[PDB]
Design an enzyme around this catalytic site. Structure first.
Site, mmCIF file in Angstrom:
data_model
loop_
_atom_site.group_PDB
_atom_site.id
_atom_site.type_symbol
_atom_site.label_atom_id
_atom_site.label_comp_id
_atom_site.label_asym_id
_atom_site.label_seq_id
_atom_site.Cartn_x
_atom_site.Cartn_y
_atom_site.Cartn_z
ATOM 1 N N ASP A 1 56.459 43.094 38.624
ATOM 2 C CA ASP A 1 55.497 43.762 38.785
ATOM 3 C C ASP A 1 55.878 45.407 39.943
ATOM 4 O OD1 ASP A 1 53.967 42.569 36.936
ATOM 5 O OD2 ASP A 1 52.367 42.143 39.118
ATOM 6 N N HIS B 1 48.361 40.328 39.505
ATOM 7 C CA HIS B 1 48.911 39.942 39.080
ATOM 8 C C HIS B 1 48.397 39.614 37.387
ATOM 9 C CE1 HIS B 1 53.068 39.806 37.121
ATOM 10 N NE2 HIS B 1 52.501 38.124 36.263
#
EC number: 1.1.1.37
Lengths: 325, 333
Positions: free
Chosen positions: B159, B187
């Protein structure tokens, strides 16, 4: 920081490319000082997958990756190239591959830099490479090569397993001839470091029968064995081999070491027909390869070298019937 | 040369592992002077595939790869480990959320935590990748009480790298000229990609990202949505998850543990939240900005949290709290 080089990878939505692109973009092939403009070509049906590959490359945040271009068009893919890595081929078969590599040779002949280095990977590698070279007469024939470095690394690995050393302590194995089941993995001129000392590989093995039999069959059949096990390609090791092959062109071979490369056979002193793309031992300096001259060829080796030359000649004559189209 | 370290990759016959093993074996993660004993775990009917992977690693001729062990047994896979990279898990397919996999995969991570607890070195660093990564990591840590809870981390570095890449596109720089982005929290689709503390090199000067772009609405809206939905976009395009870029992010995450974070930079990592000063509940596995030295992470303290950031950080803490309860209740039965 050097000026950027433009590098094409074809078949860019396939398995081998997926294991290769990070190593190009991270500096491990052309050097940590060498920015890359990466051009990715595949066929139109693969363009949706290729867009996903492009997204992943962006998501790697690679400082040397100056740009990435995804395309299904030859005039974009081949423009102004410094390096072309021709991975994509057809998965009659030879007729369809001649069509691909005649087209890509023609594209190299008009769009790329005349100094482009062309490394052919897609099978049948040698004959595809020969086809592309014949279709690109304005590119020096010496700038074309095909990948036998995977066979080379596989041969090193088999010797290392028999001797209990790391494969990088084995040097100067040779893959002669075709990237196929007739290739000759030759260790008559190879050395291995054992207990700190270099010794000939035949001397170290004390098993002539293995080196002339099972070792040869194991290397010739290794790709089929990996596919049978993984059900997918041999992409991780093929990509590493491409990197080794291209790195040695770019930076040269180590002192005392030669490597295997399919190259144009013209003028060879080993009794191989001219006008073939055939794997030879070569040393590389300043991006130019040179045949290792003066290796004595014993009778076993001569027979194996001739049997793989025979297959290459057969492939060439079958392919070139389709060349004019 | 140092003495060899033992590194486990689970799910070793799968796609992410296939993109990762070469980078471990070639020295790019643990250093050019660090030999590796690579331990590979997958399930019994995948051992033929793993044999093929072992053949390919042999065929790479990697001098730092001292040995490769393939197994389907926890007592082999987790023995004497220095590093455990827990990839193996069911992936999502197109149209799923990562939380759909919670009950499928937490059962595996409880087992692997227990195996870590008895077989691994107590100094083992555990990096959790399989989805849902935060809750899988929390589960593993609770099953391994004899391993310091700080030794467990989960992957938000993908990410993080995705966020850098989107900022780089908007500002016209390379993604590595962006630094100090932060992925807070889970996440998942509630992750908060935060650039209030990020800096960009523009014309030889360091400027804040909000100051450089002058488009607050994009940074608070479409930027967040793009980073949250990026994993699903790759799956839709490739019909497979994002293995090249996930493996690269694993390498970044593990390298920064092993060598430390660059001067002046912090990185995103899911870690145990105990004692944080950002209003996050304790006893969560939650992504924070950290600096690392001597293989030990430390929270970056003192970053001001504005009202928008507060709302996003609390929403993703709430989701992690819900996931934690779901895993606990499912595993209690």
């Amino acid at each position: 920081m050097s000026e950027p080089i433009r590098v094409l990878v074809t078949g860019a939505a396939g398995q081998i490319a997926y294991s290769l692109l990070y190593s190009i973009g991270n500096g491990s092939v052309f050097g940590k000082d060498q920015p890359i403009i990466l051009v990715l070509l595949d066929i139109t049906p693969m363009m949706g997958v290729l867009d996903g590959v492009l997204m992943e490359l962006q998501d790697c945040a690679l400082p040397l990756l100056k740009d990435v271009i995804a395309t299904d068009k030859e005039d974009v893919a081949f423009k102004d190239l410094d390096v072309a890595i021709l991975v994509g081929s057809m998965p009659d078969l030879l007729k369809a591959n001649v069509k691909i590599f005649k087209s890509q040779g023609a594209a190299l002949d008009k769009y790329a830099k005349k100094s482009v280095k062309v490394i052919v990977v897609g099978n049948p590698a040698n004959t595809n490479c020969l086809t592309a070279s014949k279709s690109a007469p304005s590119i020096p024939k010496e700038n074309f090569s095909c990948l036998t470095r995977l066979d080379h690394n596989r041969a090193k690995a088999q010797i290392a397993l028999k001797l209990g050393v790391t494969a990088n302590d084995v040097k100067n194995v040779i893959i002669w001839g075709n990237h196929s089941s007739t290739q000759y993995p030759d260790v008559n001129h190879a050395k291995v470091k054992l207990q700190g000392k270099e010794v000939g590989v035949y001397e170290a093995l004390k098993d002539d029968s293995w080196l002339k039999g099972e070792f040869v069959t194991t290397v010739q059949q290794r790709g089929a064995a990996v596919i049978k096990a993984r059900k997918l390609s041999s992409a991780m090791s093929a990509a590493k081999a491409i990197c080794d092959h291209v790195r040695d062109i770019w930076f040269g071979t180590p002192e005392g070491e030669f490597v295997s490369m399919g190259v144009i056979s013209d003028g060879n002193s080993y009794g191989v027909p001219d006008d073939l793309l055939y794997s030879f031992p070569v040393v590389i300096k300043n991006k130019t390869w040179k045949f290792v001259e003066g290796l004595p060829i014993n009778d076993f080796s001569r027979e194996k070298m001739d049997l793989t030359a025979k297959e290459l000649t057969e492939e060439k004559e079958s392919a070139f019937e389709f060349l004019s189209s």
